[PDB]
Every structure is written in C-alpha cells, then in structure tokens.
C-alpha cells in the first residue's frame, strides 16, 4: 500500500501498522570522507536507538508494552482522541517536554524487573 | 547518584546496579581519517560484545542467568566474599585465565538448549 512515511498524515492507530516501512529505511578523498561520515553517522544513530530499547526491555520489538503507568499530567486525553484523531507528528509535539521523564521511568522499571527475575531463579 | 565508573571502587554487589551507566557510554583529510577510524572501531567493538551475548542466549539483557555450573577450580570463594568484599576490577584479575573456558561453555550450552527447544515444538 503506502511506502515510506505514507502514513505520516494518518491517525496514530491507522499508522503503527507501517512500522516496518520506516524501520527498514533507517538502515577526491574529500568526497570519500564526507560520505563515510554520513554512513558512520547513520549506523551510530541506529545503534543508539537499539541500545535504548534494549535497556527498557524492548529489544527486538516494534511494539513494546511496558510496566510504567501514564501520568495524566503528561497528556490528559482519552484513547479515542489519541489513537483516532491525532497523528504521530501532532502527538510528538504535545508531549515533547515529557520525553526525558518517561525515558527515565522506563529504564528504572526495567532495572527492577530484571533484578526481581534473578531472585526468582 | 554516581556517573560513569563511579562504582569502580564499590563492591560487586553494590555495583551491578549501575550497569546502564557504563553501557550507555560505549555508544586536513588526515584528521578526518583518524576520527573515522576511531568511530568505526567503537562500533565494531560494541557489536562484537553484542554478538557474543547473542550466541550465549543473553541478547537484550544486562544481567543474564545461564545454565552453566561454576567450577570451584575457577575461584573457590563463597558468595559473601565475591559479592560483598571484592570489586569488579579485583575479580577480573582473579579469573582472567578462565575467561575463555567459561565463554566456550556458555556457547555450547546455548547450542544444546536451542536445539532442544526446536524438538519440543
């Protein structure tokens, strides 16, 4: 159907079915250096996102359901507005200021989970 | 609390709660080449460790409990000394000579586990 970013204007729940479409598009000596820098950067950016998913316990997934509650102060909206009316670009603007808080919480709940699972073994 | 390597002088069980602190810090043409080599190497070293965890069945984890027994000949100490008195730098010296043996055993038990799990499906 749609190709890369074709779902950008779609709602969040219509999109998020195309996650593999975007994931797969992330992959004279002076010209050689400029291009190696571009390629090295693409790899480094990719790996930082993968490392981050790993420490949150979401390695290998495109959709990862976590064990952190949603604070209503981050966005006081119902699922109907978020998944049926909004697009991902709009959502990203709405909660930009809470991104680092959420990320810190995700890392911490994984550290606790990982240890509890060791004690049970 | 502590930042990168701040737990280096702490005991092994006090440390190992800071694993994400260290994991996240691993990420004129002549100057361009020297820096690309440094960046390419950082990526290659990172990936070798990740590949190794993968073949041992520990992908995506910071703490991975395996199915290999500990030979008392590698280190004849009780959990109390290892986790409460020793630091990781001291431990690394103590068992340096057994690292390759342990790694070989981890790879082999994973190969057997992976096959048994196929036969059960």
């Amino acid at each position: 159907f749609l190709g890369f970013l074709g779902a950008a204007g779609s709602t969040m729940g219509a999109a998020s079915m195309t996650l593999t479409v975007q994931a797969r598009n992330l992959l004279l000596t002076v010209w050689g250096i400029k291009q190696l820098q571009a390629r090295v950067l693409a790899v480094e950016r990719y790996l930082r996102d993968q490392q981050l998913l790993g420490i949150w316990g979401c390695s290998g997934k495109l959709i990862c359901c976590t064990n952190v509650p949603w604070n209503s102060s981050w966005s006081n909206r119902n699922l109907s507005e978020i998944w049926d009316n909004m697009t991902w670009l709009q959502w990203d603007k709405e909660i930009s200021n809470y991104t680092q808080i959420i990320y810190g919480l995700l890392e911490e709940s994984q550290n606790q989970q990982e240890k509890n699972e060791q004690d049970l073994l | 609390f502590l930042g990168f390597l701040g737990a280096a002088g702490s005991t092994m069980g006090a440390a190992s709660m800071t694993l994400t602190v260290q994991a996240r810090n691993l990420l004129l043409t002549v100057w361009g080449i020297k820096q690309l080599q440094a960046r390419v190497l950082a990526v290659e070293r990172y990936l070798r460790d990740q590949q190794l965890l993968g073949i041992w069945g520990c992908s995506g984890k910071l703490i991975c409990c395996t199915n290999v027994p500990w030979n008392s000949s590698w280190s004849n100490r009780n959990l109390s000394e290892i986790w409460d008195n020793m630091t990781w730098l001291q431990w690394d010296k103590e068992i340096s000579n057994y690292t390759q043996i342990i790694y070989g055993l981890l790879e082999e038990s994973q190969n057997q586990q992976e096959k048994n799990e196929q036969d059960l499906l």
């Epitope: 240890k115 509890n116 004690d119 049970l120 | 069980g13 009780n78 959990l79 986790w83």
Partner: antibody, heavy 124, light 109 residues
Framework: EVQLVETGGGLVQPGGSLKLSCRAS????????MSWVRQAPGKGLEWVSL????????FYVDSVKGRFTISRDNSKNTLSLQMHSLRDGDTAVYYC??????????????????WGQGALVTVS | ALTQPPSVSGSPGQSVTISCTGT?????????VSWYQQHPGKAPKLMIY???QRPSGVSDRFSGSKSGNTASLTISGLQADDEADYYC???????????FGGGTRLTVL
Amino acid sequence: EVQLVETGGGLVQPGGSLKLSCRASGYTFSSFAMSWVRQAPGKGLEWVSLINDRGGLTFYVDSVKGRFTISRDNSKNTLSLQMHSLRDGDTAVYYCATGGMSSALQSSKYYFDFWGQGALVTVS
Amino acid sequence: ALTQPPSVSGSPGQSVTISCTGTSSDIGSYNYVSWYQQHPGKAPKLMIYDVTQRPSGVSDRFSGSKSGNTASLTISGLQADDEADYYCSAYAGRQTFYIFGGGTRLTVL
C-alpha cells in the same frame, strides 16, 4: 541482639479487616527477607506469607492468597500484614520472623532465624 | 504436611530422637529441613537449619540428619531445660513454600 516487635489489634468481627505490623531493630532490616507464621490457639505452626528484602516479591499460602497483603517499608524498619474478610479459622498468634527466602547473590536461607513474640488475633 | 505426633521422653543424660516424616516432592528432594524449639507461651527458637547445621548459641547437644524422606533431631545429654515442643519444617519448593509438622512434646524423666 535483635528485636522484632509485633503490634496491631487483636479482636475483629468476621467479614472485617485488620492490619498488623512489626518493628525491627538490631540488624540491617533491608538485608533480610521476612515472613509471617501463625500459631493456632491449640495446634502447630503454619506459614502464611513471605516478602523479599527489597519488597518487590511476595508469596502466600493458598488459604489467604486472595485475602491478605504483605508489605514492607525499609525506611522505617517495618513490616505490615493487611488482613481482609477474616474467617474464624484465622484466629491465631501471628509471628513476625526474619528469614524464609534469599537474595540470589548471597547464601540461601530457607529457614527462619529470628522470631518476634506474636500478636494475638481473634475473630469473633 | 510433615508428620510426627507422639510425645517423646527419657531421663536426664539419655538421648532421644524426634522424627519428621514427609514425602518425595518435599523433604526427599530438598535439603532444607530446619527444627524449632518452643516452650509454651514463648516464640520458637531455631535449633537446626538446612540439615545438620546449628546456629551460633545452640549447644552441641542438638544435632540432626536425614535419610530418604525422613529427618530427625537428636538430643544427646538430655536436660530438664529441654522440656519444649519441637517442630520440623521443610522447604517444599516454589508455590508451596513451607510446611510444618505438628510438634512433639519432650518430657524429661
């Protein structure tokens, strides 16, 4: 020398609720797992619940599994046990004890090292 | 759970044995069988843990062992001060963590 002191009400109606607690001292509270054990008025000992040293993992005997909650606060050195519903069969002395589990990075216990004196709870 | 209902007795200086019988998916498979001493009206004290080990502060008059699915507590130089109820318990795996037997009353003659 360590101490474990149980406190809490001792008389309830069936169908109600009761919260017991246990104050600890003389040892690092946070280094040990803890549990509750009942002494029936005229019989033996029964294990009821167990909580991990960090408070994240709890276990229960089937007979109270849907009724009791075990909780821990390491900043106050206390345990608590919240009983709900309550049956006549729950009349017992409830002992606070240290032990029961382990933390997998230290030697195991699987036994109880210290006991308090016990709170007496009667269901009418 | 675990069983041993009878009273147990003997004269000062005589040894006595207190049994504790369980099953295979219990006492047979796990070596975690502690023993507790309780004088009526008092909280229990740990006497033996794991199988044979005693806590510091516990005298050498108390020892124990196991065979098959049966564990036992041995009291050697029996004293009048041993008049207490004795209980055995065991780790019975995950899900069912602990079980206890009824205890036995030790009478010194």
